[PDB]
Design an enzyme around this catalytic site. Structure first.
Site, PDB file in Angstrom:
ATOM      1  N   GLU A   1       1.788   2.162  -3.610  1.00  0.00           N
ATOM      2  CA  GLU A   1       0.795   3.033  -4.296  1.00  0.00           C
ATOM      3  C   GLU A   1       0.881   4.352  -4.096  1.00  0.00           C
ATOM      4  OE1 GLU A   1      -3.379   1.792  -3.454  1.00  0.00           O
ATOM      5  OE2 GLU A   1      -3.900   4.055  -3.098  1.00  0.00           O
TER       6      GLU A   1
ATOM      7  N   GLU B   1       5.812  10.443   3.534  1.00  0.00           N
ATOM      8  CA  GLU B   1       4.356  10.142   3.187  1.00  0.00           C
ATOM      9  C   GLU B   1       3.780   9.315   4.458  1.00  0.00           C
ATOM     10  OE1 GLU B   1       2.239   9.976   0.976  1.00  0.00           O
ATOM     11  OE2 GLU B   1       3.417  11.683  -0.050  1.00  0.00           O
TER      12      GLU B   1
ATOM     13  N   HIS C   1       0.907  -1.247   0.040  1.00  0.00           N
ATOM     14  CA  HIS C   1       0.039   0.039   0.079  1.00  0.00           C
ATOM     15  C   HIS C   1       1.066   1.207  -0.041  1.00  0.00           C
ATOM     16  CE1 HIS C   1      -2.171   3.413   2.119  1.00  0.00           C
ATOM     17  NE2 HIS C   1      -3.042   2.769   1.218  1.00  0.00           N
TER      18      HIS C   1
HETATM   19 ZN   LIG Z   1      -3.944   5.920   0.540  1.00  0.00          ZN
END
Ligand SMILES: [Zn+2]
Ligand SMILES: CCCCCCCCCCCCCCCCCC(=O)OC[C@H](COP(=O)([O-])OCC(O)COP(=O)([O-])OC[C@@H](COC(=O)CCCCCCCCCCCCCCCCC)OC(=O)CCCCCCCCCCCCCCCCC)OC(=O)CCCCCCCCCCCCCCCCC
Ligand SMILES: CCCCCCCCCCCCCCCCCC(=O)OC[C@H](COP(=O)([O-])OCC(O)COP(=O)([O-])OC[C@@H](COC(=O)CCCCCCCCCCCCCCCCC)OC(=O)CCCCCCCCCCCCCCCCC)OC(=O)CCCCCCCCCCCCCCCCC
Ligand SMILES: CCCCCCCCCCCCCCCCCC(=O)OC[C@H](COP(=O)([O-])OCC(O)COP(=O)([O-])OC[C@@H](COC(=O)CCCCCCCCCCCCCCCCC)OC(=O)CCCCCCCCCCCCCCCCC)OC(=O)CCCCCCCCCCCCCCCCC
Lengths: 35, 485, 456, 40, 192
Positions: C69, C139, C66
């Site tokens: 992504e 992130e 994930h």
């Molecule tokens: Zn997300």
């Protein structure tokens, strides 16, 4: 049996007869739990 | 230019031969004739079971709209894309803007009575049959239209055309159905109390056109439950539900069958006779309104009127400007110049709603309830500088809008309702190529030429939620005045 | 004799057979390309479908899939982040992505003339993204906020916890987001290890739909994906019968529940029957109902629920079926009042147990009609078609044409449903998850002994 | 009828009508016909 | 495969019945065979003059006098323990309903006292059919529900919710669901 402040329900759906004893003895889960 | 409708004449036929063209339909299954069972038992799903007999060489259908008319007045429009499921819809020119002090609420009653008992079917049988065919069906009220529609496999169309037309040809309105259906008139608004956005929409409408036409409420109030008797419903229908006020639209059906089965519906019966009704122009009042409730934001909206509405020539200007500002992207005017420069706004938006002969255009925002007086200042600046545009943003917007136009019409229900609505509004359908040719022509100057005209009437102002810090009416209008609005 | 016996009979319309072909081709490196041309559309959809997801993380780095992504949009060897974003936007196009337990998807929408560019972009961000450590370390903020929000959408947390309690021993158990400590501990090397272990040519397919030509698309893929590396036993996931209940009396009167059974794989012969059983049980909402009152509905489960104690015992219920590469899940999700929960659940269990004893062909045909309406009703736009192409290409190694699906659906009758249910659902293990005022909640053993009837 | 709980009295109805038909058949055979065939 | 074979039997029989369906009204076949019609037609002149005639006249005399003593109509003899008539009574308008209520009250009181009314109070026709338009509607409405819902023997959960589970929809109307509570104050179904 249970004190009146414990057997007060959050829901409002009518208790069916076959569940009488179940909700006369209702108790709150103070703090919640996982099982 | 209006389309050249093809005539469909009435013809009378032997019922025992028409019964050879009726689809097969079953509700009981008394035993079953086929005993072979699951003939593909034990075959994996990555192993084909098609025989060469079931192969074909593909021939497309032709998908330009076909236009026809029955002798009694009904207009019919159809398309085919070779899908297996069809979309069917009946459009009536009976909205709430046509009611008065004696009628208020009647359209809602009619919608709440859709698919009730008619001359030759009961309510129970109707809805149960619609369920068992597998379909989904319904009725929708607006401020200018009433719409019935249904949807399932295309081979069931002959069984659905009656049930849609019934409602306008001969309903019975038995008292004990009206009485039983009443509570749904109140729940419709009881649910609006947890949909703030829609609530603000209704506030905007009733404040913009106070007490007339588009201003009327979309629901039955308490005062509206008096005149809930059959005679008022019936007398209202006799004034609007004549054939020349209707359109029937079909997608993924063969047009000659549609024409045939529609003609076979009106051939025996007298429809509601025509009426030369007249419509009054909306009067725009504007004004101001507030409504407090424990919501944790200050919801605010400000709006101005669009003169002429959908029949005004500048329908493209507003729709381009909305995308310059920011619709319901991250290189838009509001996103760059508001949301990225203030910590205390959750959302800012431009909105644009149009009707046959008037509309409104404005801005909407959610803010920290302690800073509403700053929210007003931000909105005033934004309105201040809509008059002027630069070609980078303008080109960005025109390209974006073309893309959206083309990609929104890849879906049958949207297409059906679009075609219907356009035919009711001006008797013409605008094909997307024409929309693009119109978009391409919008100039930099025309934006100013439109906005200078938009600001010539008072504003409409709405606040909702924790409004405890919103300035006063005079303060808001003076803030707008200072910013040159 | 009578005209009432002369009616037109066409179970399957001719249009089910008159459909345009799906064209397929495999490139030397193993990449597969699929296409279908639709004359009645102006635009096209094109994307990449990848046979990898969170099931292919390792327990130490669970959550890397994930994270990747997000990383793929941060910048590549050829274009910076600002350049990449502006080259998304200046096309006036759409670009979407997402990942799941077994599949990952990227796709775009455009007019035909811009398909080349799109392919280029896609390839770039898939093959040549720079996973900078000083961007990985940022992130983490966004992913933690994403998790924070996800805990508020109750249906998804319920289904995640159902997977957690059902597949204890398998990477199907893993959540897509990954634990908190893993979000904080994530590291560039973990992400690159995931890439270099899963992004191989055998696992990717390219699909399109709309105004597209198979030849040009195949040539473009050959041109751009030449750099993708080539590739160099597993056993069935075990299904555990357990409960996982979060009791909480300080969140209002409503209880949420999900119940699950063991399903079948994508390729199983009975898959279709499962798709049908899900429809035979169906769904219900008290707020929004269409035009049929629940108390008179043709669906017997809805009818029984809506007539309980004359007031009816549920806010919402809906059944579901999910198929994976080697196993599945089958069950239902519900919302109901504190004091209604017991009936709320046992009615639907009675529902599902009926499928093995007493279902009749009126119900089977109603369910066929509704299932056909649903499925055949989705496949309208280019995106739906491209998604279907890619999904079937990964799941079956092919795309199944409409006529085949309809022909296989037609021949299922009541006895066949009553056979399959008896094969998989009668006297089976079940898994349970719930949240809220669960004082009413039934025992696990109650739900498990419900799966058979002592009558008969 | 739909929406009703009386389900066991119909069965008793059919059983009773059955049983009376039975009893009358046997009684006609026993009390009348078999003797009659001695007088025929 | 036993079940599918018996399916085949049922299906063929149903298709025969379907193929013979008319498409319009056709008069019903007589209720009696031609032999009995002949015999009745032969014996009519004696039977109607001596026996059936006076029987059918005496009957109406008896009925009329009993209804006039009490001031009832004929359609006041039907109960609301009958579902069809219950519906019919639901569909009534105010005036007819009120008059029926009043007549029933007076009849109860008069049968309590056992006193005749004066003959000038008895000058009316008791056999007017004032309930017919409503009974026909009730029959229609209650037939469609059988057709669309009652066509199968549906399966339920037993002894739950106060209902036995074999079809009832009103609680505690059967003995095995008597006595719903052991403590508390009870309650009524109409107040849920
Ligand atoms: Zn997300
Ligand atoms: C001194 C006298 C003493 C008499 C004592 C009698 C005691 C008997 C108790 C009866 C059983 C309990 C009933 C409660 C049912 C609750 C209602 C309900 O919803 O049930 C659904 C349930 C149906 O299941 P379902 O809804 O499909 O779903 C079930 C769930 O999925 C999953 O199920 P679940 O988990 O929900 O559990 C359901 C559970 C519910 O129960 C509970 O939860 C609690 C536990 C129940 C009580 C257990 C203790 C009872 C002790 C049994 C032994 C008694 C022997 C007495 C002998 C006297 C000797 C002097 O029900 C059972 O499983 C009961 C099974 C036992 C009953 C069947 C016995 C009949 C056998 C007959 C064989 C032939 C013999 C002929 C020879 C003569 C013999 C005398 O109903 C039942 O099956 C219950 C039993 C129904 C009765 C069947 C017919 C009985 C007649 C037998 C023949 C009579 C012979 C007389 C002739 C004499 C010749 C001389
Ligand atoms: C000599 C030449 C002439 C010979 C005589 C010829 C006679 C011909 C004429 C026949 C006249 C009618 C006979 C009765 C027909 C009943 C038809 C029927 O089913 O009606 C359905 C009808 C309701 O149907 P529905 O409207 O569709 O409602 C559906 C409901 O779901 C249904 O549920 P629900 O709750 O609404 O209904 C109550 C439910 C449940 O009821 C209860 O739970 C009540 C339990 C009370 C138990 C108290 C102890 C009774 C001990 C037996 C006494 C027998 C005395 C016999 C007299 C002769 C004595 C020498 O009961 C039933 O549903 C009925 C079950 C079948 C009753 C059978 C009664 C007769 C035979 C009984 C004895 C069998 C022999 C062995 C034992 C002998 C020991 C001395 O029920 C009634 O009307 C029943 C009324 C009450 C009468 C029976 C009372 C006794 C109950 C005994 C139950 C079995 C256990 C026996 C003891 C075993 C251990 C020792
Ligand atoms: C205390 C009780 C214990 C608690 C638990 C409850 C125990 C009961 C379990 C037994 C029931 C099993 C059968 C399940 C059927 C499910 C059907 C369904 O979907 O449900 C909807 C369906 C009703 O829905 P509907 O069709 O819309 O309603 C319309 C009407 O039914 C009107 O429909 P229609 O007019 O269109 O006509 C339809 C009719 C058309 O058919 C006919 O009318 C045929 C008539 C031919 C004449 C021959 C007689 C037929 C009756 C057979 C009786 C044999 C059973 C006894 C065997 C003894 C073995 C020792 O259909 C039938 O008759 C088919 C059902 C017949 C089944 C009856 C026997 C089932 C018992 C099997 C187990 C036997 C073991 C017993 C052991 C010893 C102790 C008892 O349910 C029923 O019809 C119920 C049938 C079963 C009878 C009720 C059960 C009794 C409950 C009260 C307890 C009384 C106990 C008294 C003792 C007290 C002790 C103190």
């Amino acid at each position: 049996g249970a004190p009146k402040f414990e057997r007060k329900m959050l829901g409002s759906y009518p208790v069916s007869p076959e569940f009488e004893m179940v909700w006369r003895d209702r108790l709150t889960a103070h703090g919640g739990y996982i099982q | 230019p209006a389309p050249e409708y093809r005539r469909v004449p009435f013809v009378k036929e032997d019922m025992e031969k028409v019964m050879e063209e009726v689809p097969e339909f079953k509700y009981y299954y008394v035993g079953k004739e086929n005993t072979k069972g699951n003939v593909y038992e034990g075959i994996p799903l990555d192993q084909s079971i098609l025989e060469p007999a079931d192969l074909r060489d593909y021939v497309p259908p032709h998908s330009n709209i076909q236009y026809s008319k029955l002798d009694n007045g009904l207009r019919i429009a159809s398309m085919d894309r070779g899908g297996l499921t069809a979309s069917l819809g009946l459009f009536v020119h009976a909205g709430t803007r046509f009611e008065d002090v004696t009628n208020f609420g009647v359209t809602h009653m009619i919608q709440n009575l859709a698919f009730a008992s008619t001359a030759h079917l009961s309510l129970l049988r109707t809805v149960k049959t619609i369920e068992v065919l597998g379909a989904n069906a319904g009725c929708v009220v607006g401020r200018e239209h009433l719409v019935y529609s249904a949807e399932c496999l295309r081979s069931h169309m002959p069984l659905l055309v009656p049930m849609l037309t019934g409602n306008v040809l001969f309903p019975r309105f038995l008292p004990w159905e009206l009485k039983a259906c009443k509570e749904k008139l109140i729940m419709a608004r009881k649910r609006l109390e947890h949909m703030p956005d829609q609530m603000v929409s209704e506030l905007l409408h009733t404040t913009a056109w106070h007490n007339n036409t588009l201003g009327h409420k979309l629901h039955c109030t308490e005062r509206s439950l008096g005149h809930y008797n059959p005679d008022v419903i019936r007398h209202y229908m006799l004034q609007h539900f004549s054939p020349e006020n209707m359109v029937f639209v079909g997608v993924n059906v063969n047009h000659d069958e549609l024409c045939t089965w529609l003609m076979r519906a009106f051939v025996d019966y007298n429809a509601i006779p025509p009426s030369k009704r007249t419509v009054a122009s909306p009067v725009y009042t504007g004004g101001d309104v507030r409504l407090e409730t424990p919501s944790p934001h200050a919801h605010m909206a400000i709006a101005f009127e669009t003169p002429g509405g959908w029949n005004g020539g500048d329908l493209v200007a507003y729709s381009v400007l909305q995308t310059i500002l920011g619709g319901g992207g991250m290189y838009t005017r509001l996103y760059l110049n508001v949301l990225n420069q203030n910590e205390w706004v959750e959302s800012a938006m431009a909105f644009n709603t149009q009707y046959t002969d008037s509309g409104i255009f404005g801005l909407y925002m959610l803010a920290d309830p302690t800073k509403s007086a700053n929210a007003v200042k931000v909105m005033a600046e934004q309105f201040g500088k809509m008059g002027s545009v630069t070609k980078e943003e303008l080109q960005r917007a025109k390209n974006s809008l073309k893309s959206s136009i083309f990609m929104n019409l890849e879906c049958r229900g949207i297409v059906m309702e679009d075609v219907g609505r356009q035919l009711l509004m001006s008797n013409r359908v605008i094909s997307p190529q024409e929309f693009c040719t119109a978009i391409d022509a919008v100039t930099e100057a025309d934006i100013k030429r439109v906005v200078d005209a938009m600001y010539k009437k008072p504003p409409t102002v709405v606040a909702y939620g924790d409004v405890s810090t919103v300035p006063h009416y005079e303060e808001v209008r003076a803030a707008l005045r200072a910013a040159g609005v | 004799v009578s005209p009432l016996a002369r009616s037109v009979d066409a179970a399957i319309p001719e249009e089910a057979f008159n459909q345009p072909p799906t064209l397929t081709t495999t490139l030397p490196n193993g990449i597969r390309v699929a296409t279908q041309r639709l004359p009645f559309h102006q635009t096209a959809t094109v994307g990449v479908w990848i046979d990898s997801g969170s099931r292919y993380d390792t327990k130490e780095t669970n959550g890397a899939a994930h994270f990747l992504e997000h990383m793929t949009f941060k910048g590549t060897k050829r274009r910076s982040r600002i350049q990449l974003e502006q080259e998304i936007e200046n096309m006036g196009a759409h670009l979407n992505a997402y990942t799941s337990r077994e599949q990952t998807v990227y796709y775009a929408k455009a007019f035909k003339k811009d398909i080349p560019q799109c392919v280029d972009i896609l390839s770039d961000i898939l093959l040549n993204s720079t996973i900078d450590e000083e961007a990985v370390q940022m992130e983490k903020h966004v992913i933690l906020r994403e998790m924070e929000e996800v805990e508020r959408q109750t249906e998804e947390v319920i289904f995640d916890r159902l997977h957690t309690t059902a597949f204890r021993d398998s990477p199907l158990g893993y959540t897509i987001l990954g634990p908190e400590e893993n979000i904080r501990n994530m590291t560039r090397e973990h992400i690159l290890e995931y890439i270099n272990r899963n992004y191989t040519s055998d696992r990717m397919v390219v699909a399109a739909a709309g105004d597209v030509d198979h030849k040009e698309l195949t040539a473009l893929v050959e041109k751009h994906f030449a750099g993708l590396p080539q590739p160099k036993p597993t056993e069935k996931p075990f299904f555990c019968g357990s409960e996982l209940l979060h009791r909480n009396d300080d969140m209002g009167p409503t209880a949420h529940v999900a119940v699950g059974f063991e399903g079948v794989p994508w390729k199983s012969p009975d898959a279709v029957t499962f798709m049908l059983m899900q429809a035979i049980v169906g769904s219900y909402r008290k707020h929004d109902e269409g035009i049929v009152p629940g108390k008179v509905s043709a669906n017997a489960t809805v009818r029984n629920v809506c007539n309980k104690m004359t007031v009816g015992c549920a806010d919402m219920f809906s059944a579901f079926n999910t198929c994976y590469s080697d196993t599945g899940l089958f069950g239902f999700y519900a919302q109901c009042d504190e004091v209604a929960l017991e009936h709320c659940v046992m009615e639907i269990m009675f529902g599902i147990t009926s499928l093995s004893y007493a279902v009749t062909d009126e119900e089977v045909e109603r369910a066929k009609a509704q299932l056909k309406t649903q499925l055949l009703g989705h496949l309208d736009s280019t995106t739906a078609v491209a998604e279907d192409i890619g999904r079937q290409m990964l799941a079956y190694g092919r795309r199944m044409p409409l006529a085949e699906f309809l022909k296989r659906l037609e021949v299922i009758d009541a006895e066949e449903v009553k056979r399959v249910a008896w094969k998989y659902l009668h006297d089976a293990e079940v898994a349970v998850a719930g949240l809220g005022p669960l004082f009413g909640m039934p025992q696990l053993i109650n739900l498990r002994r419900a799966t058979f009837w002592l009558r008969y | 009828s739909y929406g009703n709980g009386t389900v066991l009295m119909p069965i008793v109805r059919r059983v009773f009508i059955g049983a009376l038909v039975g009893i009358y058949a046997y009684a006609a055979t026993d009390v009348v016909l078999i003797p009659g065939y001695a007088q025929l | 495969q036993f079940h599918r074979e018996i399916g085949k039997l049922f299906a063929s029989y149903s298709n025969k019945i379907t193929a013979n369906s008319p498409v319009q009204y056709v008069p019903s076949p007589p209720t009696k065979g031609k032999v009995r019609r002949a015999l009745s037609s032969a014996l009519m002149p004696v039977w109607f003059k001596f026996f059936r005639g006076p029987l059918d006249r005496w009957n109406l005399a008896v009925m009329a006098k009993y209804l006039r003593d009490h001031g009832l109509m004929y359609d006041d003899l039907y109960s609301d323990k009958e579902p069809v008539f219950a519906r019919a009574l639901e569909l009534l308008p105010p005036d007819i309903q009120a008059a029926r209520f009043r007549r029933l009250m007076r009849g109860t009181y008069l049968n309590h006292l056992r006193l005749y009314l004066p003959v000038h109070e008895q000058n009316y026709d008791p056999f007017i059919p004032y309930m017919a338009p409503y009974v026909e509607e009730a029959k229609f409405q209650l037939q469609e529900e059988e057709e669309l819902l009652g066509y199968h023997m549906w399966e339920g959960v037993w002894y739950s919710g106060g209902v036995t589970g074999f079809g009832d929809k009103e609680p505690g109307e059967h003995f095995l669901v008597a006595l719903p509570n052991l403590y508390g104050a009870g309650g009524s179904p109409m107040q849920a």
